[PDB]
């Protein structure tokens, strides 16, 4: 229920199903373009599992709306994010965690 | 003078106590390093012994009263003889650091008043004095580190927040963090709560590919037009995607300076620059990046065609991709000097030009760059106005400046 | 005139159609001779890095002129200002081949003129303050006719070679390294005992040319009378009443991004406004820029932009009320409906003024102060020492960006083509936003030092195993940023050692001390591969058997999952054999150049070359790599 805009169209129909290893290569910056994560940097394809409540709810909602080869600007909401608490050290309270993802493979 | 007045206050030591204060400081002075190593210790032993005889007579408390009783005004009294208030207060802190610097015995029995000290940290008349008192007491006793609590640190960081940048205040936090040998964890997680996540006060650092723009040797003022095409993008060879922006820019304005003002150089981030081209095609116009869509949300892929145009006598900039409308936005500009295509790029990229040697063109707007080569003026695409020039022997010099389609008859 | 071939001005168009107008005037001239009425009759200064300034030797370089004009080539003290152009003080020491006059606080006749294609050559004695200039081997002579150029100057902070271009001038230099191009160094030079600028060096020499773009500074004492005063009520006054009263552009210190107001009291022409940092117009003009919408159909398509600089014009009591969006107020009246279009734009407060009288300002529906600094109970307006009164100054030196790009071009369709990426290394002050690249700080010591102590703090916060904060910094320093910052051969000496500390204290310490604790225990199992150790060669401590206990490595990837009690264990991860392969290169790379014993070495001194280079290699030796 968050703003999701497709950057690069994949195919759309590849819906990510629960119980799949969603291999992505993503990054993400703050409101002012200040980077706070880049899986491209550490050369790590970030893998996660849907429904298991692994990553926060903004990423968990935007992961379902994508497909294979689809880049997307997951412009998340601070209420859906860590909130008025934030991540203690990395992310201040009330941020817009603008992500930039790319799906690679499923399981 | 804490009363009204007396107007004949003979009890006024100013020149006497300031003389002794410059006399007491050197009496506690540390010895220099360029010295015989046995003579260093014998001076040092007399120094450490000298501080302890001041301690048992409680001089630090007797110093501290005179700081208190001078923490009244902010510049007072009969203000001709009391004019030197900035000296006596500032010299009193520099004495107070000298009674401290070496002795653990003098620091711990002092300690007890850092919560008094950081209360006075807001005075900002001689804060660097009262910083220096705080720096020596922290490094010399691990006792006092377990007295300073979180509310003191919030006042410490806020003084760095107001007073610009200091390596002196950072030497506090480096010493506040790790003790003589141990690393108290409660101060470390307290600091990264405050300094880090704001990205507000320190200096944040990054790296992005070098950005360079181009120009086809030709200034441009009928309805002027050009065409572009793309062959190989390969958008990810970085920890970043690449960029592609095409558009127009001025000529008497914004010498091409890469990344000393605006970020990385770029395209469209200056006011003289007006670029376009994005996946979801929206713009860049002087650091603006707002998200006006297009009815494809299409990439800059490895095959697409770019149609760019601007009419004569109409500041009306709008472009096209593959002959498809982009819902153009750029209006209401100014002219001082002519214009040109300003294609920029940062990749292992390769693109074409269409000049004549055209491949595709929509009609509307009828003056290609093929029209701009009528009289004599040649065509060579170069590195966009070139305060530098790249070579291999010696990248040599280039002078500052060497500088209309309506010619002028004399009114005779 | 619709297919018009006459859309061309006179000085460029076809010169034979004008012969119908030229020869018709010549037949109008042939009549006049028949009738008896016979128709009878700025600069661009190039300095080097300040830390190359020699102080004892006989040093030489040469300059190859191409064009005509001001060619002020010679030497310079490091404190030469870029603005006041060359030679008109004691800071520059050069000679212009044009006009035949030598440059020290002015001009005095010396030498002979230049030639298009010359190779000048410049010679300095440092055992005595006797400078010399040559021209193509031929020594330029005085008015009395001696070989010298200058006499009895001061060897203080060394001397740096500087050429000064004119307006449309082209030149070419060399600083050693170009042993084929030593044109007249063979004849005079070696046969006088002189030295190029590559007697042992191995890198290039980055230069600091003057930027044409203006930026802002503080308010230093570099004027007859320009003065700012910090008064508390809560005001700031000025004065510029001298014999130099041209143009003053006043920026303030920190911006405002997107409630309360801010005042101005002028004693005597004036433009009040608000500045975003993309403002470098330096003139006396009134110029500047909007963009209409695109609303997916057309027909509405009206308003996006109003971004530019903002505009206004006994006591001039104008007040800048802001937010919400932008507004105006003027002396109780309302010149309202300002450029109220700003999502989150930075706003300096900014007025432009020129000298007509002294005391041209006095500064400051609630009150201001809270709306700028961090805390916001903060009702009363309060002045702070972070506030400066920035003046748009004309030029400062800026680095050459020594390696640019590998761009190519073609003609048949004009294929430009690149292959390889070249990355910046850039930081920015956020509070007065402007980007600087890292390899510029070699001349800004007051920002080199404060950023160096920032790295001391990052190394000390995650000291002695705080894997929470070391994970928090790994998303803050981002390890392949280090992997370039390891290898800049032009990075400052302190920021060399600071980044090597920060790589170890994130990743390579908490395992390194963990194997440092168990270095003297020697517990061992009695398994079968233990039995196959010979103790002897018929020695080499690089064996691979190692059947001791050796406590293992574990690592963690700095992700952003909601499993927050799982960072919590070991350390941030890192790529291993990328790092051990570059060090083995950088070991052989550094020891080969230091065996030539350059003047260069990486961090200035050989310590900053070697000390972190060994220390990262030493810690990696223990780590089971």
From Swiss-Prot, chain A:
Leading EC class: isomerase
Tissue expression as described in the entry: Detected in heart muscle (at protein level). Isoform 1 and isoform 2 are ubiquitous with highest levels in brain and thymus.
InterPro entries (alphabetical): FKBP-type_PPIase, PPIase_dom_sf, PPIase_FKBP_dom
EC numbers, comma separated: 5.2.1.8
GO MF, any single term: FK506 binding
Family annotation (Pfam families): FKBP_C
Domain PPIase FKBP-type: 19-107
GO cellular component, one term: sarcoplasmic reticulum membrane
Main subcellular localisation: cytoplasm
Keywords assigned by UniProt, alphabetized: Cytoplasm, Isomerase, Rotamase, Sarcoplasmic reticulum
An example Gene Ontology biological process: positive regulation of cytosolic calcium ion concentration
Activity regulation statement: Inhibited by both FK506 and rapamycin.
Subcellular location: Cytoplasm; Sarcoplasmic reticulum
Reactions this protein catalyses: [protein]-peptidylproline (omega=180) = [protein]-peptidylproline (omega=0)
Quaternary structure and interacting proteins, as annotated: Identified in a complex composed of RYR2, FKBP1B, PKA catalytic subunit, PRKAR2A, AKAP6, and the protein phosphatases PP2A and PP1. Interacts directly with RYR2.
Function of the molecule: Has the potential to contribute to the immunosuppressive and toxic effects of FK506 and rapamycin. PPIases accelerate the folding of proteins. It catalyzes the cis-trans isomerization of proline imidic peptide bonds in oligopeptides.
Protein family (similarity comment): Belongs to the FKBP-type PPIase family. FKBP1 subfamily.
Protein name: Peptidyl-prolyl cis-trans isomerase FKBP1B
Lineage, highest ranks first: Eukaryota, Metazoa, Chordata, Craniata, Vertebrata
């Amino acid at each position: 229920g968050v703003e999701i805009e497709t950057i690069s169209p994949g195919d759309g129909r590849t819906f990510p199903k629960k119980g799949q290893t969603c291999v992505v290569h993503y990054t993400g910056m703050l409101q002012n373009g200040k980077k706070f994560d880049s899986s491209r940097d550490r050369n790590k394809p970030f893998k996660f599992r849907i429904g298991k409540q692994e990553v926060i709810k903004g990423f968990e909602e935007g992961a379902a709306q994508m497909s294979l080869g689809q880049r997307a600007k997951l412009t998340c909401t601070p209420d859906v994010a860590y909130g008025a608490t934030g991540h203690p050290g990395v992310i201040p309270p009330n941020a817009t965690l603008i992500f930039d993802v790319e799906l690679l493979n499923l399981e | 003078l804490s009363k009204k007045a007396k107007a004949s206050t003979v009890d006024l030591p100013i020149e006497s106590v300031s003389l002794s204060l410059q006399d007491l400081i050197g009496y506690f002075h540390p010895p220099d390093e360029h010295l015989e190593h046995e003579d260093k210790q014998n001076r040092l032993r007399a120094l450490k012994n000298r501080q302890n005889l001041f301690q048992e007579e409680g001089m630090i408390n007797l110093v501290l009263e005179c700081i208190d009783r001078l923490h009244v005004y902010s510049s007072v009294a009969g203000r001709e003889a009391g004019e030197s208030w900035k000296s006596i207060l500032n010299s009193l802190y520099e004495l107070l650091a000298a009674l401290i610097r070496g002795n653990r015995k003098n620091c711990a029995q002092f300690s007890g008043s850092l919560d008094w000290l950081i209360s006075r940290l807001e005075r900002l008349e001689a804060s660097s004095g009262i910083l220096e008192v705080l720096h020596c007491v922290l490094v010399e006793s691990p006792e006092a580190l377990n007295i300073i609590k979180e509310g003191h640190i919030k006042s410490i960081i806020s003084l760095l927040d107001k007073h610009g940048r200091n390596h002196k205040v950072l030497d506090v936090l480096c010493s506040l963090c790790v003790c003589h040998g141990v690393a108290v964890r409660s101060n470390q997680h307290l600091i990264c709560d405050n300094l880090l996540p704001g990205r507000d006060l320190l200096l944040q650092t990054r790296l992005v590919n070098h950005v360079s723009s181009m120009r086809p040797n030709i200034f441009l003022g009928k309805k002027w037009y050009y065409e572009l095409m793309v062959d190989h993008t390969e958008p990810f060879v970085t920890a970043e995607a690449t960029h592609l922006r095409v558009g127009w820019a001025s000529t008497e304005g914004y010498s091409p300076y890469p990344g000393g003002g605006e970020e990385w150089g770029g395209n469209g981030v200056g006011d003289d620059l007006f670029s376009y081209g994005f996946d979801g095609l929206h713009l860049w116009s002087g650091c603006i990046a707002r998200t006006v869509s297009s009815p494809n949300q299409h990439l800059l892929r490895t095959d697409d065609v770019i149609s760019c145009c601007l009419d004569l006598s109409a500041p009306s900039i709008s472009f096209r991709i593959n002959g498809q409308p982009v819902q153009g936005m750029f209006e209401n500009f100014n002219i001082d000097g002519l214009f040109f295509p300003v294609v920029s790029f940062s990749a292992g990229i390769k693109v074409r030009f269409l000049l004549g040697e055209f491949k595709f063109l929509p009609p509307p707007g009828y003056a290609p760059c093929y029209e701009a080569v009528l009289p004599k003026e040649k065509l060579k695409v170069e590195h966009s106005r070139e305060y530098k020039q790249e070579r291999t022997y010696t990248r040599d010099l280039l002078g500052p400046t060497v500088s209309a389609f309506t010619p002028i008859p004399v009114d005779t | 005139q619709r297919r018009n071939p006459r859309l061309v001005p006179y000085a460029l168009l076809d010169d034979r159609t004008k012969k119908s107008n030229k020869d018709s005037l010549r037949e109008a001239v042939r009549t006049l001779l028949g009738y008896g009425y016979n128709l009878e009759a700025r600069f661009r200064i190039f300095r080097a890095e300040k830390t190359y300034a020699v102080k004892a030797g006989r040093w030489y370089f040469e300059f190859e002129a191409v064009t005509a004009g001001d060619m002020r080539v010679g030497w310079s003290r490091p404190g030469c200002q870029p603005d006041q152009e060359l030679g008109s003080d004691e800071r520059a020491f050069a000679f212009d081949g044009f006009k035949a006059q030598r440059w020290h606080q002015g001009n005095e006749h010396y030498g002979r003129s230049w030639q298009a294609g010359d190779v000048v050559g410049c010679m300095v004695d440092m055992t005595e303050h006797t400078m010399m200039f040559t021209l193509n081997g031929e020594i330029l002579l005085d008015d009395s006719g001696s070989e010298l150029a200058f006499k009895d100057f001061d060897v203080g902070d060394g001397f740096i070679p500087v050429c000064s271009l004119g307006v449309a001038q082209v030149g070419r230099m060399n600083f050693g390294k170009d042993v084929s191009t030593l044109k007249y160094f063979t004849i005079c030079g070696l046969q006088e005992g002189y030295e190029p600028f590559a007697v042992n060096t191995n890198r290039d020499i980055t230069m600091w040319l003057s930027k044409r773009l203006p930026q802002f500074l503080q308010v230093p004492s570099s004027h007859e009378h320009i003065e700012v005063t910090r008064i508390d009520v809560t005001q700031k006054s000025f004065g510029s009443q001298n014999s130099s009263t041209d143009i003053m552009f006043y920026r303030l210190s920190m911006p405002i991004e997107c409630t309360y107001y801010y005042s101005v009291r002028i004693f005597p022409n004036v433009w009040v406004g608000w500045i975003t940092s993309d403002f470098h117009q330096y003139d006396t003009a009134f110029d500047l820029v909007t963009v209409t919408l695109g609303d997916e159909k057309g027909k509405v398509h009206e308003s996006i932009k109003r971004s530019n600089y903002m505009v206004c014009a006994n006591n001039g009591l104008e007040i800048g009320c802001v937010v919400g969006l932008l507004t105006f107020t003027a002396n109780g009246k309302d010149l309202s409906t300002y450029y109220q279009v700003e999502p989150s734009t930075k706003l300096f407060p900014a007025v432009f003024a020129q000298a007509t009288s002294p005391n041209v300002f006095q500064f400051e529906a609630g009150l201001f102060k809270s709306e700028h600094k961090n805390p916001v109970p903060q009702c009363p307006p309060r002045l702070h020492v972070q506030f400066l009164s920035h003046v748009l100054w004309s030029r400062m030196p800026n680095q050459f960006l020594k390696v640019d790009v590998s761009r190519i071009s073609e003609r048949q369709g004009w294929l430009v083509q690149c292959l390889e990426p070249l990355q910046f290394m850039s930081l920015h002050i956020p509070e007065e936003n402007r980007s600087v690249d890292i390899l510029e700080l070699t001349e800004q010591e007051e920002l080199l030092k404060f950023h160096y102590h920032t790295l001391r703090l990052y190394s000390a916060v995650c000291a002695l195993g705080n894997h929470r904060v070391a994970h928090a910094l790994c998303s803050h320093v981002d390890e392949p940023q280090l992997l370039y910052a390891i290898e800049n051969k032009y990075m400052p000496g302190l920021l060399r050692a600071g980044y090597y500390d920060l790589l170890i204290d994130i990743h390579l310490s908490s395992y390194a001390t963990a194997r440092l604790m168990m270095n003297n225990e020697f517990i061992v199992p009695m398994t079968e591969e233990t039995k196959s150790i010979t103790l002897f060669p018929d020695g080499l401590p690089g064996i691979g058997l190692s059947t001791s206990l050796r406590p293992r490595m574990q690592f963690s990837s700095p992700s952003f999952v909601s499993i927050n009690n799982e960072c919590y264990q070991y350390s941030p991860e890192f790529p291993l054999d990328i790092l051990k392969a570059k060090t083995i290169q950088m070991l052989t790379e550094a020891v080969q150049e230091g065996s030539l014993h350059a003047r260069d070495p990486v961090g200035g001194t050989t310590e900053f070359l070697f000390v972190p280079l060994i220390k990262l290699f030493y810690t990696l030796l223990i780590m089971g790599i």
